[PDB]
Design a protein around this ligand. Structure first.
Ligand SMILES: COCCO[C@@H](C)CO[C@@H](C)CO[C@H](C)CO[C@H](C)CO[C@@H](C)CO[C@@H](C)CO[C@H](C)CO[C@H](C)COC[C@@H](C)N
Ligand code: NA
Lengths: 41, 53
């Protein structure tokens, strides 16, 4: 039971690392948009 | 990065870190519980061998 729960916990830690990566990707695109809009303004 | 973006990434980083800290704490607690189970199993095995000797 406990071993199963630890693995489940670890899977959540991974799911959170993937969200962090997805966050930094959106932020990067939003930043790109702001810079590009500024260059072309 | 712009202010709007920094307010956004600051929030999401803070929220994910908190969830990660909680998961790490849960893991360390599960490990504690595993040690407690091991201790309990040792008493139980000792008791059973004493009863069957
Ligand atoms: C699994 C077997 O454990 C039970 C048979 C009983 O275990 C209880 C008594 C242990 O309780 C928790 C997990 C720890 O309690 C300690 C920290 C404090 O003891 C005093 C409150
Ligand atoms: Na940058």
């Amino acid at each position: 039971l406990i071993h199963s729960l630890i693995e489940e916990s670890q899977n959540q830690q991974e799911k959170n690392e993937q969200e962090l990566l997805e966050l930094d990707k959106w932020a990067s695109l939003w930043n790109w948009f702001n810079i590009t809009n500024w260059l072309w303004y």
